[PDB]
Design a protein around this ligand. Structure first.
Ligand SMILES: Nc1ncnc2c1ncn2[C@@H]1O[C@H](COP(=O)(O)OP(=O)(O)O)[C@@H](O)[C@H]1O
Lengths: 577, 459
């Protein structure tokens, strides 16, 4: 095909010689072991091998042979309930052939070749088709797992095997075109499979963290970003989505995140129930995990595969939630190549490509009608990590002003003890107006007004905060200390959930909505308390405050009536005193 | 043509190309591959050995093996036509509406040249916007550049596209025939999301005004190269409007943060050493030239307005990208959280904000007489009240004298109604009235900046 040998091997990169006719970015095998390569530069006939795994133990003058396909995960039915290396290798089988070591020199298959499956067809043979037109529905768990024409294929059918178990590899469709569709179909990664067309979004991506659903929120096509220094909950706020999002598929993938946080979701996740079936929640799950410890270059691979997976599922028709855990390391990874190939860099040494390969990523999708005429959403909420705390640093900032919905996760907040506390005096979402329809109808018809008044206090409260630190809470009188305290409670109780309290760690709108109406009331009547002639001073020390306190803890079932009880308790417990 | 092939050394976005001689600096060329798809690359750095061409896009697939390069054309550029005036176009200058291309009347060198100084005629005219506050207090004069410093997440865009459609110069108030002069809004954003891309097109088409405007809008993802030329396009296209036919243009570029984000990358690869805090040394210059498309030029009657709106990252006024501008553009109109948190729209502060040149705006014999003094009224009045609103928190309200106690209430009516203006459009004349009214709230015979006459006719 095209073959040469090692000329210069030193570091994760190598330079082979005796090569020509290569193409940019192409998988290869290097060393006697065979390891998985990439073409990333040419210079006459010598080529920079980028070598996906480790190295060590190599000699100069060993195989170097390309096949000339440029990366791609082979996508088809049966992928859930697994874990996948950076080139989608199922570690199960690996573990079964090794022991307890990720060892080089490994080759297996992406989708297992044994299991056969219950087929069903749609179209009759002797029919016409065009790109991405649905064909067969193999069932798969609580899902219905369709199969499409691989994009950019068109023609006319000629046979169709009827129902029964059938292999993954099998050609179960023949064409009058001499072509063959088999169950899966391989698709690159650098490209970006089209869809029928692009369209606006308006459906909220529910999430159940009050803080991500009453204040800042996200569109369905949403793109956002979450940052915060080390020890800030960065991971855990993606944990919750992975077990309380509201869609078909969580596709949690993290690159450069430790084992411990991964494996845990593989021993807890079996025993839980989804809000959309009742089954083991692990059905809507991917995990393409590729922890820090592993190779260098894999950290680059990793993401773009799970972007693609994000398309692949959307494609069938569902509602992708992809979230990359800790994309920033990716930058570091990219830049480690750089160093060795000698590319002068831009600030903070990142090679100038920060935008180049960022900006393509995040733009990707949301509510986009498919070739199949389904409603496709790509939901990404990117995690990032700065390396300082200085948000001024480039790789961070470049995220803003490429995507909307910015949440910032304050650092000094969290040292105390809340979670997943954010600064809402940093943060800002954009998506928040085009959510109004759905909210009105679905939730309550007066909700957005009732929320803006909450921000009315909340963002105004700093107005006083500063003056507190300029002359104490002393000599701030009473419409003064009203607010301070109201709001004090507003974050003490409306902004801090957990991810470990047994219940109360997920909410419906309508519940949350409830909590939120109370407080307004309490503000209102208090406003009329002091104006009438009494004082907050004791009002704080009313028993009824603490009822508003503990409040969040009761569950839904009780919730209506809980809430109704305070609805009595208010009007009496003001007028009396 | 057929020709120049055997390309050696391609690393990432750079590309060396075998012996050409034909080429020129600032040439642009077709790269062709092994699969028929074609790609473009600008001609930078060339010698007696090689030239340097730059893949615009991705380079996925290329080969040491032959896959030639076609010389497109000298110093590329584009033509123009009056036809253009309701279209949808991307970057370079291709039809994104889906209706067949233009047909010239000219070709235009896209390095925009620089004017002359004598030729320029001092501004003296006026332009309404249709937004209030940015006409009353600090008034966009005609043939003027000026920019809206936004914050990180305050909503620029909307406050953009309102002031897109809304404006119409009233020559009326000055005296002359109405349709002696028509209005062209030339608009270009960049780094727009699939999301953003749609908020424009929806609003634009709504009541429609696409039929009196030109589009240009270089998607976010889209190659970084073309980005660089992108504005220069819609700038030069603007010339052809006023100088060869007279028109009154309003150019509105957007998000020049992107302009530099994107910039840097280019320079970072093409070589140089970046100066202070990055932002490649020759920024000052490069940025300068994307602003000399403005002002009226004697004899000629039409002219260009710049409003380029951009966002800072450090939320300052010290980071260079905005700071820089602030030496060559002439004023500043910020947006604060404060307003916006409390929910107003479009939040444009008062006091941070001020157009240095605006004296030759509004006039007694130009467009309404009293405006001058309204402007220095509500400003200085305002700031006086914003203190009280804080200090009332330390002493209660039982220690405010009468005159001044009213200066509190002023603020409330100012903030709640006056700078809010939803989707209501207004006009310079209706707007001045409102103002007046509010000023009536505080005690008279005191607003001593303004002269007595006027108060004797309005209250
Ligand atoms: N929702 C929560 N409830 C309780 N503790 C939390 C919560 N979120 C975070 N924490 C605590 O704070 C820690 C911060 O999360 P961590 O895993 O360190 O995130 P990262 O290192 O990715 O920023 C958690 O490990 C946990 O101990």
């Amino acid at each position: 095909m095209i073959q040469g040998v090692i000329q210069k091997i030193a570091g994760p990169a190598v330079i082979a010689k005796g090569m020509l006719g290569a193409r940019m970015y192409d998988i290869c095998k290097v060393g006697e072991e065979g390891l998985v390569g990439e073409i990333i530069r040419l210079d006459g006939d010598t080529a920079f091998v980028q070598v996906y795994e480790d190295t060590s133990g190599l000699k100069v003058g060993e195989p170097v042979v390309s096949t000339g396909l440029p990366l791609a995960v082979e996508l088809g039915p049966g992928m859930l309930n697994g874990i996948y290396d950076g080139i989608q290798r199922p570690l199960e089988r690996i573990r079964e052939k090794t022991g307890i070591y990720i060892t080089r020199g490994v080759v297996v298959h992406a989708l297992d070749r044994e299991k056969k499956w219950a087929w069903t067809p749609m179209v009759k043979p002797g029919d016409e088709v065009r790109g991405g037109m649905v064909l067969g529905t193999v069932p798969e768990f609580g899902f219905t797992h369709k199969i499409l024409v691989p994009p950019d294929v068109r023609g006319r059918v000629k046979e169709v095997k009827p129902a029964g178990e059938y292999t993954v590899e099998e050609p179960v469709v023949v064409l009058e075109d001499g072509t063959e569709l088999k169950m899966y179909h391989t698709w690159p990664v650098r490209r970006a499979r089209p869809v029928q067309r692009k369209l606006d979004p308006n459906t909220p991506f529910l999430t159940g963290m009050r803080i991500l659903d009453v204040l800042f929120p996200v569109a369905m096509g949403g793109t956002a970003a979450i940052p915060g220094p080390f020890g800030s909950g960065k991971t855990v706020t993606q944990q919750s989505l992975a077990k309380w999002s509201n869609a078909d598929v969580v596709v949690y993938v993290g690159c450069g995140e430790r084992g411990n946080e991964m494996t845990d979701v593989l021993v807890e996740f079996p025993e839980l129930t989804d809000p959309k079936t009742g089954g083991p929640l692990m059905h809507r799950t991917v995990l393409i995990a590729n922890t820090s410890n592993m190779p260098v270059a894999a950290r680059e691979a990793s993401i773009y595969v799970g972007v693609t997976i994000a398309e692949y599922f959307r494609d069938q028709g569902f509602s992708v939630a992809l979230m990359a855990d800790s994309t920033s390391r990716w930058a570091e990874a990219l830049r480690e190549i750089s160093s060795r190939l000698e590319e002068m860099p831009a600030e903070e040494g990142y090679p100038p490509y920060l935008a180049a390969r960022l900006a393509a990523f995040y733009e990707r999708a949301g509510k986009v009608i498919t070739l199949g005429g389904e409603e496709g959403a790509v939901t990404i909420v990117g995690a990032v990590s700065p390396p300082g705390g200085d948000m001024s640093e480039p790789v961070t900032q470049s995220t803003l002003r490429i995507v909307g919905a910015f949440w910032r996760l304050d650092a000094s907040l969290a040292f105390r003890r809340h979670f997943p506390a954010i600064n809402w005096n940093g943060s800002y979402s954009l998506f928040t107006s085009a959510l109004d329809p759905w909210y009105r109808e679905n939730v309550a018809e007066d909700y957005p007004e009732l929320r803006d008044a909450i921000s009315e206090l909340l963002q105004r409260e700093a107005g006083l905060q500063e003056i507190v630190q300029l002359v104490g809470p002393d000599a701030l009188q009473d419409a003064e200390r009203l607010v301070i305290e109201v709001g004090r409670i507003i974050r003490e109780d409306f902004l801090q959930q957990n991810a470990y309290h047994e219940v109360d760690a997920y909410c419906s709108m309508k519940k949350a909505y409830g909590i939120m109406k109370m407080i307004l009331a309490f503000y209102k009547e208090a406003e009329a308390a002091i104006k009438r002639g009494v004082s907050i001073d004791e009002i704080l020390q009313l028993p009824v405050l603490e009822r508003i306190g503990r409040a969040r803890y009761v569950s839904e079932e009780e919730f209506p009536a809980y809430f109704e009880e305070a609805m009595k308790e208010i009007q009496g417990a003001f007028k009396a005193l | 043509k057929k020709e120049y092939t055997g390309i050696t050394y391609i690393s990432g976005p750079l590309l060396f190309v075998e012996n050409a001689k034909d080429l020129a600096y600032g040439a642009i060329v077709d790269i062709k591959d092994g699969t028929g798809r074609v790609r473009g690359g600008q001609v930078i750095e060339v010698s007696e050995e090689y030239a340097v061409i730059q893949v615009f896009e991705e380079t996925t697939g290329l080969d040491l093996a032959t896959t030639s390069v076609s010389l497109v054309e000298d110093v590329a550029r584009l033509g123009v036509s009056k036809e253009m005036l309701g279209r949808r176009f991307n970057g370079i200058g291709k039809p994104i509406d889906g209706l067949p291309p233009i047909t010239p009347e000219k070709r235009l060198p896209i390095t925009g040249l620089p004017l002359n100084p004598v030729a320029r005629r001092k501004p003296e005219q006026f332009i309404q916007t249709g937004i209030s506050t940015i006409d009353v207090m600090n008034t966009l004069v005609r043939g003027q550049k000026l920019p809206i410093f936004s914050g990180s997440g305050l909503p620029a865009n909307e406050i953009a596209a309102q002031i897109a459609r809304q404006a119409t110069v009233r020559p009326d108030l000055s005296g002359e025939g109405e349709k002696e002069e028509p209005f062209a809004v030339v608009f270009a954003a960049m780094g727009i999301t699939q999301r953003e891309l749609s908020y424009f097109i929806q609003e634009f088409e709504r009541t429609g005004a696409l039929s009196r405007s030109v589009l240009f809008l270089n998607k976010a993802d889209d190659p970084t190269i073309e980005r660089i030329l992108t504005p220069r396009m819609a700038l030069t296209v603007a010339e052809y409007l006023a100088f060869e036919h007279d028109y009154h243009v309003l150019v509105i570029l957007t998000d020049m943060t992107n302009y530099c984000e994107a910039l840097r990358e280019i320079g970072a690869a093409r070589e140089e050493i970046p100066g202070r805090r990055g932002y490649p040394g020759y920024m000052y210059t490069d940025l300068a030239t994307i602003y000399e498309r403005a002002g009226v030029v004697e004899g000629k009657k039409g002219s260009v307005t710049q409003i380029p709106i951009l966002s800072m990252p450090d939320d300052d006024r010290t980071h260079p990208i905005p700071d820089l501008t602030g030496y060559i553009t002439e004023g500043q109109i910020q947006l604060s959280r404060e307003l916006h948190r409390k929910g107003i729209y479009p939040p444009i502060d008062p006091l941070p904000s001020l157009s240095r040149l605006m004296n030759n705006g509004v006039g007694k014999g130009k467009t309404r007489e009293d405006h001058k003094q309204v402007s220095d009224q509500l400003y200085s009045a305002y700031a006086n009240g914003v203190d009280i609103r804080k200090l009332v928190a330390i002493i209660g309200e039982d220690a405010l004298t009468e005159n001044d106690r009213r200066y509190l209430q002023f603020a409330d009516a100012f903030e709640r109604f006056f700078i809010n203006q939803g989707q209501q459009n207004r006009s310079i004349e209706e707007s001045l009235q409102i103002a007046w009214a509010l000023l009536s709230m505080l005690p008279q015979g005191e607003l001593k900046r303004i002269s007595k006459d006027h108060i004797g006719k309005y209250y």
